[PDB]
Amino acid sequence: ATIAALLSASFSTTAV
Amino acid sequence: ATIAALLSASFSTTAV
Ligand SMILES: [Cl-]
Known about the structure:
Two copies of one chain form a homodimer. By secondary structure, the first copy, chain A, is mainly β.
């Protein structure tokens, strides 16, 4: 699977 | 830089 984290603060982790 | 696309439909592109 792939997991990606985001940071902008806002922050998110999305994975499949 | 890094660019990541998301799909769930909703879809997004985030990059830095
Ligand atoms: Cl990624």
